[PDB]
Amino acid sequence: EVPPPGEIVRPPIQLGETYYAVKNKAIASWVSIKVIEFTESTAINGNTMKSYKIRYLNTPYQMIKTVTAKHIAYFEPPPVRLTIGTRVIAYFDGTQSAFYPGIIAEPLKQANRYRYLIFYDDGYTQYVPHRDVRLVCQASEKVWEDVHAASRDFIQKYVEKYSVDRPMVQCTRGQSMTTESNGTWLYARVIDIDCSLVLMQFEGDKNHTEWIYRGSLRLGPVFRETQNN
């Protein structure tokens, strides 16, 4: 169902328990692990810095790594609904299917059919149900500081300078807009709409379609509306 609001708790990581953690690259897939060793280091100043030795589960041979709590996520979905700015891993299926890091961009609500809007670290965006998210075991007070350097500045403006009155493009299927794709500003047509997302098809290829955030500066009209202030 829709979990109720409440306290978003981060219990301490336990020895022998199952979690998710960064497989290799931090912005890539997070997979099943067992916490096999706990490391704690304390300096003359006071800061007690925690580390965790993890064993990757379901592997061809023993694979061990040392990571921080910022690179580990709980195995079960939270018992409460999550809010904007919450650091998560969200399950991407894509019609490779796996857990990738992101930020809750929208909470669960009627207006979005009780789905979280995810802004993945790699720049991808999708609507995911509550059951497909896991809370990251630790986060910075400034959550964009935990986000891959690629989407960092976008997350910072979105979260830190958050406004419900931010420019959002109003569109209908069949309209065309100038749309940015990997450095190039191309011609794109609205194919589908899903609440805060718009499905754009770039003029070059009909198989080149992408779900874009309607408030993204990758859409020319949004960029135009933002320049005029």
Partner: peptide, 7 residues
């Protein structure tokens, strides 16, 4: 594949 969230 993704073009990001910003230009």
């Amino acid at each position: 594949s993704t073009g990001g969230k910003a230009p």
